[PDB]
Write a protein that binds this ligand. Structure first.
Ligand SMILES: *[C@@H]1O[C@H](CO)[C@@H](O)[C@H](O)[C@H]1NC(C)=O
Ligand SMILES: *[C@@H]1O[C@H](CO)[C@@H](O)[C@H](O)[C@H]1NC(C)=O
Ligand SMILES: *[C@@H]1O[C@H](CO)[C@@H](O)[C@H](O)[C@H]1NC(C)=O
Lengths: 49, 49
């Protein structure tokens, strides 16, 4: 997307009932900070929720 | 005036807050015109949580 929300008015979106891919999250190493707590950063594609 | 049958009023719930889930199917076009005669549709459902 082109625009984001403010820190105080952080926009919350409920993700479910959709087919999910997490490969792009780490494939594109353009993010300065990428940290997962309680979940494997690399095994995002081997987990269900 | 408009020779067609369409849903007009939704009087189920007055308001909703702190919702949890929502899913909407693709648009369709069902025949709402009144039919006279012996029953032609029988739909059976089983719900369990
Ligand atoms: C017919 O449809 C038009 C278009 O929305 C609407 O303005 C009008 O009120 C409708 N008439 C009736 C009787 O439903
Ligand atoms: C569902 O029907 C209600 C009442 O006609 C209408 O207000 C609402 O916009 C409809 N929603 C969708 C997704 O068509
Ligand atoms: C929504 O309801 C759940 C279930 O009781 C509760 O845990 C949660 O705090 C509620 N959220 C808000 C914003 O009221």
């Amino acid at each position: 997307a082109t625009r984001f929300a403010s820190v105080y008015a952080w926009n919350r979106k409920r993700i479910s009932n959709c087919v999910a891919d997490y490969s792009v999250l780490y494939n594109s190493a353009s993010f300065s900070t990428f940290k997962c707590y309680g979940v494997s950063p690399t095994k995002l594609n081997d987990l269900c929720f | 005036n408009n020779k067609s049958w369409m849903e007009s009023e939704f009087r189920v719930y007055s308001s909703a807050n702190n919702c949890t889930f929502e899913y909407v199917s693709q648009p369709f076009l069902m025949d709402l015109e009144g039919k006279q005669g012996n029953f032609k549709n029988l739909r059976e459902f089983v719900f369990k949580n």
